[PDB]
Write a structure and sequence with these properties.
Pfam families: DNA_pol_B, DNA_pol_B_exo1, DNAPolymera_Pol. Helix content is about 35%, strand content about 20%. The chain is of the alpha+beta class. It folds into six domains: about 15-80, no CATH class; about 80-305 and about 525-570, no CATH class; about 305-525, 2-Layer Sandwich (Nucleotidyltransferase, domain 5), CATH 3.30.420; about 570-635 and about 695-825, no CATH class; about 640-695, Helix Hairpins (Orthogonal Bundle); about 830-980, no CATH class. It is globular, with a radius of gyration of 35 Å. The chain starts with 13 loop residues before the first strand and ends in an 8-residue tail after the last helix.
Length: about 1000
């Protein structure tokens, strides 16, 4: 009997039986709606072919593939099976507490038991061997630690003598009635004095601190919140995995390893099957010295990818209601489950789980064989519970270390777990890799121990930009592929028809995962993630869910301690609105914030609020010097003290550039892995800025973020300053850039910056062609960059606007020389508005951009304040703009056969099309079915539709009149007769 219990189900004799009554064919006309919801006493069953079987049996003729040694008490390994392990790969790491007493009957060598006596944290390395064998290697020995000021503590209690301290902490822990679990001993702690320095400030001098080790995070946590009343505490937030990686040089979170002898030729101990803590084929106890990095050896082992996607159906009153997991009537009816070799890429298994009989189409089956793909295996069931258990039984038994699909984090996994926990009261702590007590939860964002979930939806929202992110949509843009035959509203209808129509549902389900697969092996996300994990020193599962600061803290921590630091704990030239007929050039700085940090030596360690005790070294040379926020600040440079961030980033930039110089002289396969790394360094570098300015995150320092803000500003003001001085005349520009020869346009020449924002400047170029300006702009930026700023800082050129409506602040419309329209901080469309108001509103903005007469006339408006155009007539070039509004009025009034164009719709609801019609004096009580209007020759409501077009035009083209909506309203009125106002 396992020394630690298996909490997943290896038997159920009874359970909650829920199934749609349609499934009954012994079925009167009336008894076929809704759902059965009762208790049934019998084992859960699977059907596959004419065959059946208990869902929880392992042995003979099992319907689905397993990778499982132990199944609730029985060892299913071949009598003989005893492989030896040397090298093995690691994809995931767990932290758990083990207690010596609970493990007595496990057959563990005393060095291990020693490590967990009252208690101890065990770090379990998860992965597999070259042969495919599933491994869990249990690292004993790692303790978490944290620091506290010696003399400060030594005074406020009182006792240098390191045992006195430990006793006082053990005595602190008794008094909390929160499970001291009789850990009221001075021996559950070691406390050593070391010299060190709080990272903050230039002045701060090395003090003496107590390093104190602890046996469990449980303990550490309490002492954070309680032992430190006034006393300052350092690196208490640092988990055991991260101590295990950082204190063992070279060690990684994702890599190959080998076990070897240690200190006194100590050897890793294989575990007896009955003390396995996970579902792996082999397990071992060891300490860090029994482990070594196995560099050179690099190839991904045969780990598996499960790719699934679920389909549901609504019960209750209205079967076209979107399904809700909390409803017992609203059932998961099918799950598409695909199993790949992740090292190979091959699709090994196609499984479809199905509530009710399901007969896949012959056509879909022909298409699978024809593509050299596995024949699907259809598992069918009478109830939702039987099918959910089956799926979860497969999730435990096959144990895909990797899992994927589309929106599975947002819809699929939440739906299925809501059902498992709430409706069926099944516990999940045992269904991951651990046999019990493991994490298996979704939040608002899922965490399943020993399972790396990568959701393709988010990956795709991260590489490609689109109008839509639906799969069939995504499948047509990215895989250039076309399939379009399903809608959640059709499911019920089809479900009720019979087993063939359920097959169709199953087809589109399998095909859905097929496409998601094809995408995962297109974008190889796990490899972007491994690389970050591998680089940041963190578990792969935290490279996705856990955000920003995590990826950077760890590295900051390693460096910080090298240096002998400790980390404390939780304790007016922007736009003048107007239109532009001359080209506008857009300069951007590349990774501005990180390049500032590095160039200007900015760190926790190098800043100060004091002028004194600053080595009194000297201003200018040794000092940065800034009027930051409230007051004056100072930052030392890389000769006096070099910044910890600075170092992180420089090292990462030198790494990227040395990796990038290699991409072309390596193999195709070597280049695919260097690209992922080269991109990983970029994900991590773009993080360091953010890391600084989280006011309640780990190591904030708002006075670095804010100095970077104010340096960002100065730099672009300098770029402004420069361009105006240097390029005021075309002659100097021709001397720097001889190709300007063929760029001189008719006008007078003038180069002026018009918009400044975060990291980009807009430069209006009179007398120049839009034609070669993007290429000349690179050079300009290169030139500027090489002339004004310190390395990494790099200004570049993206983009020339042939024409530009500069509305405001962060709001503009432009056509891009050589491209499309770009619209920022506005839309010219509304899903809610009728076609006609949208099409015309749009036609207007196109006249302004694409009609050269309207474009000059629009430009000329800028030569004159809004109010002065009220006095005088608008420039004639706008005749065509007015022709469009006039024209729209006529579109409405006339017996004009397209009423459809004026239809509004604001399930049952919206969908009812209507139109607003002419005539107490009524208020949109003049809705009407369209057909009725037509059939009765009813006029549309001129005043209504037109005033909506006038309003929309008015908000889009205020810019031509300094954003005064009033003046705009008045001037566009001149283009239409007053009797139509």
């Amino acid at each position: 009997g396992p020394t630690q219990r298996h909490t997943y189900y290896s038997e159920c004799d009874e359970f909650r039986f829920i199934a749609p009554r349609v499934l009954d064919e012994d079925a009167p006309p009336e008894k076929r709606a809704g759902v059965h919801d009762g208790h049934l006493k019998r084992a859960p069953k699977v059907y596959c072919g004419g065959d059946e079987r208990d869902v929880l049996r392992v042995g003979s003729g099992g319907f689905w593939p397993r990778r499982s040694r132990l199944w609730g008490g029985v060892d299913h390994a071949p009598a003989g099976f005893n492989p030896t392990v040397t090298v093995f790969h690691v994809y995931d790491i767990l932290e758990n507490v083990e207690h010596a007493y609970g493990m007595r009957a496990a057959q563990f060598h005393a060095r291990f038991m020693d490590a967990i006596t009252p208690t101890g944290t065990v770090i379990t390395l998860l992965g597999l061997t070259p042969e495919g064998h599933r491994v869990a290697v249990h690292v004993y020995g790692t303790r978490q630690y944290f620091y506290m000021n010696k003399e400060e503590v030594d005074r406020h209690l009182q006792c240098r003598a390191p045992r006195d301290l430990c006793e006082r902490m053990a005595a602190a822990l008794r008094e909390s009635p929160g499970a001291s679990f009789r850990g009221i001993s001075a021996d559950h702690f070691e406390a050593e004095v070391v010299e060190r320095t709080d990272v903050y400030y230039y002045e701060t001098r090395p003090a003496l601190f107590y390093r104190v080790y602890v046996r469990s995070g449980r303990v550490l946590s309490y002492l954070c919140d309680n032992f430190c009343p006034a006393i300052k505490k350092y690196e208490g937030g640092v988990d055991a995995t991260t101590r295990f990686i950082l204190d063992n040089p070279g060690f990684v979170t994702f890599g190959w390893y080998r076990l070897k002898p240690g200190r006194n030729n100590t050897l890793a101990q294989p575990r007896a099957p009955m003390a396995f803590g996970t579902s792996s084929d082999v397990e071992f106890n060891c300490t860090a010295d029994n482990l070594a990095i196995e560099g050179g050896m690099s190839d991904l082992p045969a780990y598996k990818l499960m790719c699934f996607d679920i389909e549901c159906k609504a019960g209750g009153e209205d079967e076209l209601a979107f399904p809700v997991a909390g409803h017992p009537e609203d059932l998961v009816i099918q799950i598409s489950c695909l199993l790949y070799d992740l090292s190979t890429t091959a699709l090994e298994h196609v499984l479809l789980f199905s509530l009710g009989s399901c007969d896949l189409p012959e056509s879909h089956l022909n298409e699978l064989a024809a593509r050299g793909l596995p024949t699907p295996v259809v598992l069918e069931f009478d109830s939702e519970f039987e099918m959910l258990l089956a799926f979860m039984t497969l999730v435990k038994q096959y144990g895909p270390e990797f899992v994927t699909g589309y929106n599975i984090i947002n819809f699929d996994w939440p739906f299925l777990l809501a059902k498992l926990t709430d409706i069926y009261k099944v516990p999940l702590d045992g269904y991951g890799r651990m046999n019990g007590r493991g994490v298996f939860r979704v939040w608002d964002k899922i965490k399943v121990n020993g399972m790396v979930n990568i959701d393709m939806y988010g990956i795709i929202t991260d590489k490609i930009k689109l109008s839509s992110y639906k799969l069939n949509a995504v499948a047509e843009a990215v895989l250039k592929d076309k399939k379009k035959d399903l809608s959640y509203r059709d499911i019920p209808a089809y479900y009720a028809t019979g087993p063939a129509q359920r097959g169709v549902i199953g087809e589109y389900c399998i095909q859905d995962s097929l496409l998601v697969g094809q995408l995962f092996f297109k974008f190889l996300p796990h490899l972007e993630l491994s690389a970050v994990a591998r680089l940041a020193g963190i578990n792969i599962t935290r490279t996705i869910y856990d955000g920003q600061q995590i990826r950077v803290f760890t590295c900051l921590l390693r460096l910080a301690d090298q240096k002998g630091f400790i980390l404390p704990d939780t304790q007016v030239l922007d736009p003048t609105s107007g239109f532009h007929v001359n080209p506008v050039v857009v300069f951007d700085f590349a990774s501005l914030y990180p390049s500032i940090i590095q160039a200007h030596n900015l760190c926790f360690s190098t800043l100060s609020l004091r002028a004194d005790a600053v080595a009194h070294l000297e201003a200018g040379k040794d000092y940065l010097e800034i009027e930051v926020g409230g007051r004056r600040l100072f930052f030392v440079k890389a000769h006096v003290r070099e910044s910890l961030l600075s170092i992180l980033l420089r090292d990462w930039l030198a790494m990227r550039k040395q990796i990038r110089s290699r991409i072309p002289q390596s193999s195709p396969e070597e280049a695919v892995l260097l690209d992922k790394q080269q991109a990983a360094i970029k994900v991590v570098c773009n993080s360091v800025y953010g890391f600084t300015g989280v006011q309640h995150g780990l190591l904030p320092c708002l006075h670095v973020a804010a100095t970077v803000t104010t340096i960002g500003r100065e730099m672009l003001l300098a770029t402004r300053e420069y361009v105006h001085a240097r390029w005021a005349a075309f002659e100097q520009l021709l001397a720097d850039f001889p190709e300007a020869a063929d760029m001189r346009a008719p006008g007078p020449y003038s180069m002026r910056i018009i918009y400044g924002d975060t990291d980009s400047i807009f430069v209006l170029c009179r007398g120049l062609t839009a034609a070669g300006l993007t290429a000349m702009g690179d050079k300009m930026a290169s030139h500027i960059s090489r002339a004004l700023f310190l390395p990494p800082i790099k200004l570049e050129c993206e983009k020339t606007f042939t024409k530009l409506l500069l509305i405001a602040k962060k709001k503009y419309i432009g056509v891009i020389y050589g491209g499309k329209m770009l619209i920022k901080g506005v839309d010219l469309v509304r899903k809610n508005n009728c076609a006609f108001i949208n099409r015309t509103s749009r036609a207007l903005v196109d006249l302004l951009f694409y009609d050269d007469t309207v474009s000059g006339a629009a430009a000329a408006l800028a030569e004159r304040p809004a109010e002065e155009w009220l006095a005088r007539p608008l420039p004639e070039g706008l005749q065509a703009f007015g022709a469009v509004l006039v024209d729209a009025h006529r579109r409405i009034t006339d017996p004009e056969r397209d009423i459809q164009d004026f239809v509004l719709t604001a399930s049952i609801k919206d969908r009812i099309p209507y139109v607003i019609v002419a005539q107490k004096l009524l208020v949109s009580e003049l809705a009407e079915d369209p057909a009725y209007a037509i059939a009765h020759g009813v006029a549309l409501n001129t005043d209504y539709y037109f005033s909506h077009l006038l309003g929309a035009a008015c908000v889009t083209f205020k810019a031509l009149f300094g954003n005064n909506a009033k003046i705009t309203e008045s001037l566009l009125k001149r283009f239409i007769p007053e009797v139509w106002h």
